[PDB]
Scaffold this active site. Structure first.
Site, PDB file in Angstrom:
ATOM      1  N   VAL A 190       8.375  -3.790  10.696  1.00 16.21           N
ATOM      2  CA  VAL A 190       8.412  -4.983  11.518  1.00 16.21           C
ATOM      3  C   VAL A 190       7.975  -6.113  10.593  1.00 16.21           C
ATOM      4  O   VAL A 190       8.600  -7.175  10.532  1.00 16.21           O
ATOM      5  CB  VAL A 190       7.442  -4.882  12.705  1.00 16.21           C
ATOM      6  CG1 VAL A 190       7.317  -6.235  13.405  1.00 16.21           C
ATOM      7  CG2 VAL A 190       7.945  -3.837  13.685  1.00 16.21           C
ATOM      8  N   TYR A 191       6.903  -5.869   9.857  1.00 17.76           N
ATOM      9  CA  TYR A 191       6.392  -6.853   8.929  1.00 17.76           C
ATOM     10  C   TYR A 191       7.484  -7.171   7.911  1.00 17.76           C
ATOM     11  O   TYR A 191       7.857  -8.330   7.720  1.00 17.76           O
ATOM     12  CB  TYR A 191       5.132  -6.319   8.232  1.00 17.76           C
ATOM     13  CG  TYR A 191       4.598  -7.241   7.158  1.00 17.76           C
ATOM     14  CD1 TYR A 191       5.090  -7.178   5.855  1.00 17.76           C
ATOM     15  CD2 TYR A 191       3.673  -8.242   7.466  1.00 17.76           C
ATOM     16  CE1 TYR A 191       4.689  -8.089   4.891  1.00 17.76           C
ATOM     17  CE2 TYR A 191       3.260  -9.165   6.502  1.00 17.76           C
ATOM     18  CZ  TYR A 191       3.778  -9.088   5.215  1.00 17.76           C
ATOM     19  OH  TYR A 191       3.429 -10.029   4.264  1.00 17.76           O
ATOM     20  N   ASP A 196      11.018  -5.798  -3.562  1.00 19.17           N
ATOM     21  CA  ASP A 196      11.625  -4.647  -2.905  1.00 19.17           C
ATOM     22  C   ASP A 196      13.148  -4.613  -2.752  1.00 19.17           C
ATOM     23  O   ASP A 196      13.816  -5.647  -2.672  1.00 19.17           O
ATOM     24  CB  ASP A 196      10.975  -4.465  -1.534  1.00 19.17           C
ATOM     25  CG  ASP A 196       9.506  -4.152  -1.637  1.00 19.17           C
ATOM     26  OD1 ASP A 196       8.781  -4.297  -0.632  1.00 19.17           O
ATOM     27  OD2 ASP A 196       9.076  -3.748  -2.736  1.00 19.17           O
ATOM     28  N   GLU A 203      10.233   6.159 -11.621  1.00 17.10           N
ATOM     29  CA  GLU A 203       9.069   6.894 -11.158  1.00 17.10           C
ATOM     30  C   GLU A 203       9.071   6.909  -9.643  1.00 17.10           C
ATOM     31  O   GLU A 203       9.802   6.151  -9.013  1.00 17.10           O
ATOM     32  CB  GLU A 203       7.814   6.196 -11.674  1.00 17.10           C
ATOM     33  CG  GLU A 203       7.878   5.887 -13.165  1.00 17.10           C
ATOM     34  CD  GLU A 203       6.719   5.032 -13.655  1.00 17.10           C
ATOM     35  OE1 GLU A 203       6.850   4.440 -14.751  1.00 17.10           O
ATOM     36  OE2 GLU A 203       5.681   4.957 -12.960  1.00 17.10           O
ATOM     37  N   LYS A 218       7.409   5.986  -6.231  1.00 19.95           N
ATOM     38  CA  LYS A 218       6.394   5.076  -5.744  1.00 19.95           C
ATOM     39  C   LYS A 218       5.434   5.906  -4.885  1.00 19.95           C
ATOM     40  O   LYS A 218       5.714   6.172  -3.720  1.00 19.95           O
ATOM     41  CB  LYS A 218       7.041   3.971  -4.912  1.00 19.95           C
ATOM     42  CG  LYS A 218       6.109   2.846  -4.530  1.00 19.95           C
ATOM     43  CD  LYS A 218       6.859   1.815  -3.694  1.00 19.95           C
ATOM     44  CE  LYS A 218       6.043   0.575  -3.465  1.00 19.95           C
ATOM     45  NZ  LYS A 218       4.831   0.832  -2.668  1.00 19.95           N
ATOM     46  N   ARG A 245      -6.948  -3.410  -5.879  1.00 19.60           N
ATOM     47  CA  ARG A 245      -6.130  -4.538  -6.296  1.00 19.60           C
ATOM     48  C   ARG A 245      -6.660  -5.864  -5.763  1.00 19.60           C
ATOM     49  O   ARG A 245      -6.614  -6.874  -6.456  1.00 19.60           O
ATOM     50  CB  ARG A 245      -4.682  -4.362  -5.839  1.00 19.60           C
ATOM     51  CG  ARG A 245      -3.770  -5.454  -6.373  1.00 19.60           C
ATOM     52  CD  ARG A 245      -2.336  -5.286  -5.931  1.00 19.60           C
ATOM     53  NE  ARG A 245      -2.198  -5.416  -4.487  1.00 19.60           N
ATOM     54  CZ  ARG A 245      -1.035  -5.393  -3.844  1.00 19.60           C
ATOM     55  NH1 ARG A 245       0.092  -5.249  -4.524  1.00 19.60           N
ATOM     56  NH2 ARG A 245      -1.001  -5.518  -2.526  1.00 19.60           N
ATOM     57  N   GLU A 303      -2.216   4.827  -8.791  1.00 18.01           N
ATOM     58  CA  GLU A 303      -2.444   4.984  -7.366  1.00 18.01           C
ATOM     59  C   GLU A 303      -3.421   6.103  -7.042  1.00 18.01           C
ATOM     60  O   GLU A 303      -3.515   7.093  -7.770  1.00 18.01           O
ATOM     61  CB  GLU A 303      -1.110   5.290  -6.680  1.00 18.01           C
ATOM     62  CG  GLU A 303      -1.042   4.941  -5.207  1.00 18.01           C
ATOM     63  CD  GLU A 303      -0.616   3.501  -4.964  1.00 18.01           C
ATOM     64  OE1 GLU A 303      -0.371   3.147  -3.795  1.00 18.01           O
ATOM     65  OE2 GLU A 303      -0.525   2.721  -5.938  1.00 18.01           O
ATOM     66  N   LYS A 337      11.726   0.716 -13.435  1.00 15.04           N
ATOM     67  CA  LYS A 337      11.150  -0.137 -14.464  1.00 15.04           C
ATOM     68  C   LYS A 337      11.973  -0.270 -15.732  1.00 15.04           C
ATOM     69  O   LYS A 337      12.618   0.679 -16.165  1.00 15.04           O
ATOM     70  CB  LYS A 337       9.768   0.400 -14.846  1.00 15.04           C
ATOM     71  CG  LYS A 337       8.768   0.437 -13.706  1.00 15.04           C
ATOM     72  CD  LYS A 337       7.483   1.152 -14.120  1.00 15.04           C
ATOM     73  CE  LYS A 337       6.474   1.180 -12.975  1.00 15.04           C
ATOM     74  NZ  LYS A 337       5.359   2.124 -13.210  1.00 15.04           N
TER      75      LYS A 337
HETATM   76  N1  NAD Z   1       2.379  -3.541   8.968  1.00 12.56           N
HETATM   77  C1  NAD Z   1       1.808  -4.632   8.485  1.00 12.56           C
HETATM   78  O1  NAD Z   1       1.248  -5.441   9.191  1.00 12.56           O
HETATM   79  C2  NAD Z   1       1.824  -4.945   6.989  1.00 12.56           C
HETATM   80  C3  NAD Z   1       1.177  -6.178   6.483  1.00 12.56           C
HETATM   81  C4  NAD Z   1       1.212  -6.445   5.071  1.00 12.56           C
HETATM   82  C5  NAD Z   1       1.859  -5.545   4.157  1.00 12.56           C
HETATM   83  N2  NAD Z   1       2.479  -4.343   4.712  1.00 12.56           N
HETATM   84  C6  NAD Z   1       3.153  -3.411   3.751  1.00 12.56           C
HETATM   85  O2  NAD Z   1       2.574  -3.616   2.419  1.00 12.56           O
HETATM   86  C7  NAD Z   1       3.610  -3.350   1.418  1.00 12.56           C
HETATM   87  C8  NAD Z   1       3.783  -4.495   0.411  1.00 12.56           C
HETATM   88  O3  NAD Z   1       2.535  -4.738  -0.271  1.00 12.56           O
HETATM   89  P1  NAD Z   1       2.765  -4.059  -1.742  1.00 12.56           P
HETATM   90  O4  NAD Z   1       2.062  -5.155  -2.664  1.00 12.56           O
HETATM   91  O5  NAD Z   1       2.112  -2.699  -1.919  1.00 12.56           O
HETATM   92  O6  NAD Z   1       4.304  -4.214  -2.118  1.00 12.56           O
HETATM   93  P2  NAD Z   1       5.263  -3.036  -2.634  1.00 12.56           P
HETATM   94  O7  NAD Z   1       5.279  -2.032  -1.377  1.00 12.56           O
HETATM   95  O8  NAD Z   1       6.582  -3.449  -3.119  1.00 12.56           O
HETATM   96  O9  NAD Z   1       4.419  -2.383  -3.565  1.00 12.56           O
HETATM   97  C9  NAD Z   1       4.157  -1.875  -4.901  1.00 12.56           C
HETATM   98  C10 NAD Z   1       2.834  -1.172  -5.054  1.00 12.56           C
HETATM   99  O10 NAD Z   1       3.116   0.250  -5.089  1.00 12.56           O
HETATM  100  C11 NAD Z   1       2.322   0.980  -5.977  1.00 12.56           C
HETATM  101  N3  NAD Z   1       3.029   2.013  -6.863  1.00 12.56           N
HETATM  102  C12 NAD Z   1       3.160   3.318  -6.512  1.00 12.56           C
HETATM  103  N4  NAD Z   1       3.790   4.068  -7.411  1.00 12.56           N
HETATM  104  C13 NAD Z   1       4.079   3.199  -8.397  1.00 12.56           C
HETATM  105  C14 NAD Z   1       4.755   3.394  -9.666  1.00 12.56           C
HETATM  106  N5  NAD Z   1       5.228   4.508 -10.092  1.00 12.56           N
HETATM  107  N6  NAD Z   1       4.870   2.240 -10.445  1.00 12.56           N
HETATM  108  C15 NAD Z   1       4.376   0.988 -10.044  1.00 12.56           C
HETATM  109  N7  NAD Z   1       3.745   0.799  -8.865  1.00 12.56           N
HETATM  110  C16 NAD Z   1       3.619   1.900  -8.088  1.00 12.56           C
HETATM  111  C17 NAD Z   1       1.450  -0.061  -6.658  1.00 12.56           C
HETATM  112  O11 NAD Z   1       0.093   0.099  -6.248  1.00 12.56           O
HETATM  113  C18 NAD Z   1       2.029  -1.431  -6.316  1.00 12.56           C
HETATM  114  O12 NAD Z   1       1.054  -2.447  -5.983  1.00 12.56           O
HETATM  115  C19 NAD Z   1       4.879  -2.982   2.273  1.00 12.56           C
HETATM  116  O13 NAD Z   1       5.051  -1.545   2.407  1.00 12.56           O
HETATM  117  C20 NAD Z   1       4.594  -3.664   3.566  1.00 12.56           C
HETATM  118  O14 NAD Z   1       5.391  -3.203   4.636  1.00 12.56           O
HETATM  119  C21 NAD Z   1       2.464  -4.042   6.114  1.00 12.56           C
END
Ligand code: NAD
Length: 321
Positions: free
Chosen positions: A38-39, A88, A115, A117, A138, A172, A288
């Site tokens: 939803v976000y 994304d 890789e 995630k 972070r 992670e 990457k």
């Molecule tokens: N439901 C809600 O209210 C709400 C609110 C804010 C954010 N979100 C969620 O937060 C996310 C976005 O924040 P985000 O900064 O994590 O964005 P992103 O999901 O695009 O995230 C990337 C993150 O994934 C991780 N990662 C895992 N494996 C990795 C790999 N092999 N290489 C590099 N990174 C790796 C890292 O920690 C990195 O910060 C989304 O899934 C979003 O839906 C939900």
């Protein structure tokens, strides 16, 4: 332009507040009120409006910020080198368009280190002369929460590297499905809000002030980024993964170096199937640019690197009923 200046402005305001509110609940409270998609849908709309009318981008917009404000309680953990988020992708096209941008910036095709995630919490470990001195969340990308203690309760985190070298790396921290399942059945008996998804369980645990508890939760790790190389000699992301392992960090073995964008997609397709067979939740794939000199060339934006893109996966939960 389907949207008129007025319609987009008002919409961007609605979107900015709504989204900001949700980020606060998700990062500053690990207690979100809306589903992640939803976000994401709303977030994606804001990005489109900001792209259609750049004049509407403001400093407070979630497109200009990473993570969230630090959870007071813990000690502030400044990041000598900033941490970011990722851009994304939700379609084979996005993946191909990303490759298209890269090719235009590099001027030739590039190989990608792929890789999984790992769906958990983002962490940064600091080592001084082979000694684990600090572990951080972070945070907002520039200041996290000091969770060194908590991190020392995790088996995979090495206390001393294999070489008395100083380095800074990211990765992670997660909670395997095996334990997510268990833990919850337990919390239920204790009449406690069983954790929603493996991600919030890990985050809920690590950001617990009482390590006494944290210790018994059972988390694991995967390191995939070298922030401060120190004496490390890797020139590519694929090598750095080997090096990180070699000096003592646990690293994910599913990685694959792809020579073509078709291979990237197949890699994505592949692990989207094997997904269930893994003991840890993954929320997608991280593609990457393998060569570091090239990553440097592509650089970052206020919020994310230009040399990477994350293909997102709905939680298997939503693919299994
Ligand atoms: N439901 C809600 O209210 C709400 C609110 C804010 C954010 N979100 C969620 O937060 C996310 C976005 O924040 P985000 O900064 O994590 O964005 P992103 O999901 O695009 O995230 C990337 C993150 O994934 C991780 N990662 C895992 N494996 C990795 C790999 N092999 N290489 C590099 N990174 C790796 C890292 O920690 C990195 O910060 C989304 O899934 C979003 O839906 C939900």
């Amino acid at each position: 332009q389907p949207l008129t200046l007025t319609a987009a402005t008002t919409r961007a305001q609605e979107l900015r507040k709504q989204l900001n509110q949700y980020s606060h609940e998700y990062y500053v409270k690990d207690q979100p009120s809306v589903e992640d998609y939803v976000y994401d849908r709303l977030y994606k709309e804001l990005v489109d409006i900001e792209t259609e009318f750049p004049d509407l981008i403001t400093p407070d917009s979630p497109t200009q910020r990473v993570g969230g404000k630090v959870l007071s309680g813990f000690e502030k953990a400044p990041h000598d080198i900033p941490m970011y988020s990722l851009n994304d992708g939700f379609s084979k096209e996005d993946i191909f368009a990303f490759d298209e941008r890269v090719r235009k910036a590099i001027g030739k095709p590039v190989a990608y280190c792929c890789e999984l995630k790992i769906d958990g919490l983002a962490i940064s470990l600091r080592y001084e002369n082979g000694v684990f001195v600090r572990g951080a969340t972070r945070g907002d990308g520039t200041v996290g929460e000091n969770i060194t203690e908590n991190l020392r309760t995790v088996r995979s985190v090495p206390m001393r590297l294999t070489e008395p070298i100083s380095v800074e790396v990211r990765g992670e921290c997660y909670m395997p499905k095996q334990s997510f399942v268990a833990l919850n059945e337990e919390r239920e008996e204790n009449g406690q809000d069983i954790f929603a998804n493996p991600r919030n369980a890990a985050a809920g645990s690590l950001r617990q002030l009482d390590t006494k508890i944290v210790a018994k939760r059972n988390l694991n790790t995967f390191l995939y980024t070298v922030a401060d190389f120190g004496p490390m000699k890797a020139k590519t992301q694929f090598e750095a993964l080997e090096e990180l392992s070699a000096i003592g960090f646990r690293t994910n073995p599913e990685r694959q170096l792809c020579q073509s964008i078709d291979e990237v997609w197949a890699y994505i397709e592949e692990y989207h199937e094997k997904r269930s067979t893994l003991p840890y939740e993954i929320d997608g794939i991280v593609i990457k640019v393998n060569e570091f000199a090239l990553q440097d060339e592509l650089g970052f934006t206020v919020k994310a690197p230009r040399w990477a893109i994350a293909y997102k996966f709905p939680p298997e939960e939503a693919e299994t009923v």
